[PDB]
């Protein structure tokens, strides 16, 4: 019982989603009954009979449990719900209200509400003619279209590593004591010379000449983290298209030896095909939680920029270390989504919705003004893991590499701050 | 659907002509298709492009753009080799809106066809005339 | 030769379609051709344009220009008259060098045509579909 | 053709080496193939790159070039992962005027081989020597 249906175990007591379940589902065979009796409110034969009778029917629909369950990789999308349903002509709840007014003595009105049927239903079709085709041909327009975009944090994310290689400088001048180099970075900050000159505490000159600097780092960190989540969204590539189809229908006798009902229901067949791009080797390795969450990072940022500090009498030159050690910590978390990313899973939707159509009325032939609803309770939902393409033409390696080793030169930095 | 060989029956005044084109292969840069008779000099062979086109924020209309290049080989230029000539260029372009229903672009490809077949084009395009 | 009436045969996806276009005079500016369908409204009507030219200091080709407005009538609008919805538009050119011969030309006339009638172009034209 | 599984037999001094490629897919962007033995760390895995190109004003010819990337795994690094050492570097390139034909370039592409298993370059090759 230690393992779920969805998770599985490791070499260092890992929690992580079974692949082999995860990708094809136990199918699991339906007994029991959904809507076996309904209930007629009205009047027949003259006369006031309400009576509970099961209609024609019958129970076999192959069906699956969902799971939502933790991501398999860092920053990444919610993992895909497999489900596998077994398409048994399926049935949508008829409610129709009639009135009826011919003959000098027959009248009645009856409303059969949650009536069943079985229809004739396509339960497999393909439509990647059209799709796969139109799926390589967004990767073109891709460099065009939000080019600008990744092209443009690249350039915003260069300038935050050079001020993490001057800042340096400043902090390790108290240590050994050369305080000229310290003078000539804050002369290159402000525009004019307004300094204090009193003579004070020899780390006291630190926080006077890194003023401008915090407001800086801080307006970088601030905008990086929206649009950080906004390119994760791009990668997850999917397009398609609906068409309109009709579907026909007979052989109903809801009205025993009354009359007949018949009708045309018009459905939509709608495929769409999406695609999972992440990293490789990224989902052998993750637990329930083990790293350091973003829902704070907004917040932890702005706690050192403030002039309103908790650890002056705590030793700051123990809190100012840790600070940095958790930059380049939660860096070289971020640094390992860009070193190889290819397709990892891949999974194919097949759906058919419901529109609006139109019912007929009609009794033995005679023209009848006929008023109904009705909805969609189950559809055909079967979504089919696979890794494969039949013509895949894709390459981000090269377009990301430039922002790997940026990532690589900070956190080699920050190792160089230690005690 | 497949690029695949395209044989073509009825070809030239005569009609008796014949040609194949092999795909080419696609242009991802551009997104165009390319298709060819098979010849002995590329720069000699027939060439024959299709495209299509998805709207865009530039555009909301489907393009799709059909370009023919039938060069003229010059077979003896006092030169061991033949050499590009007359460059023949056919184009035919389409536009639709995204409601554009199929029987509408299915009406535009036959009478298209038709015109090409009608007695007024030909003297239009074989001898050059106006429309008097 | 002379404008008249075009009556075309083998229309539309199922080829039963007919269609009959009279000529619709010449515009003297551009020196274009029109042709139409006699339908009830002009703005409805469908029409067909077809143009030649002569090479200038500007161009030394010859241009052969045709192209096809195919309106979509909305015939209630909830408004006592019609009105246009979608335009199709089919256009189509071509150009030649002063010494282009006359097959060449024939060549690029029937050829153009079966590609139309190609089964590649057809789920290219209808369905909107790429080479694949 | 349609980018496959490539195996090759016969390679390595030996030639009992034998090595597949799986398609990697196309760069769009500079339209160019690759394809890659099945490894461990794409880092690590073998790479194959080939592109055509089309003339255009800025070169009249056709250009081919093929790039070959075999790094070199350091298995303990002292380390848990392996690192790449040393990147094998081999580059090929080909051009063509628009008027070259079909055997001239099967021409080349034969004899090119032949002077790879030819007992020059293997001296040239394997033990870096000039022509003495």
Redesign the interface.
Known sequence: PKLPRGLRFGADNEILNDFQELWFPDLFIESSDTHPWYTLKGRVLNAHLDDRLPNVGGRQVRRTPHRVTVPIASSGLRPVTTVQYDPAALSFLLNARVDWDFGNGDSANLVINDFLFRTFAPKEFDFSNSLVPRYTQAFSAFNAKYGTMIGEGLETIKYLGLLLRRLREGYRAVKRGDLRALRRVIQSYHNGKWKPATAGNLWLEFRYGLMPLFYDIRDVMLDWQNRHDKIQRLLRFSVGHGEDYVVEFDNLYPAVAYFKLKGEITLERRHRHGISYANREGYAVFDNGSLRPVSDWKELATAFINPHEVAWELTPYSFVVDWFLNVGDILAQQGQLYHNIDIVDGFDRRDIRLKSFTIKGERNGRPVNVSASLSAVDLFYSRLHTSNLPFATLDLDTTFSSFKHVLDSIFLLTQRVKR | ????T?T??????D?K?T?VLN?RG??????V?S?SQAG????LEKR?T???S?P?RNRKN?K?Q?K?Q?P?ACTANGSC?????????????????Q??????????????????????????????????
Do not use: H, M
Request: no cysteine.
């Open positions: 659907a497949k690029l695949e395209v073509l029956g009825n070809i030239g005044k009609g002509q040609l795909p696609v242009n991802p840069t551009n997104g298709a298709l002995a000099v590329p720069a024959v299709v495209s299509v998805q865009s489907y799709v059909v023919i039938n003229t080799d033949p050499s590009v000539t007359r460059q023949a260029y056919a184009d035919v372009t389409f536009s639709f809106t409601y554009s229903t199929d029987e509408e672009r299915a009406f535009v490809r036959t009478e298209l066809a038709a015109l090409l077949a009608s007695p007024l084009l030909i003297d239009a395009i074989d001898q050059l005339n106006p429309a008097y």
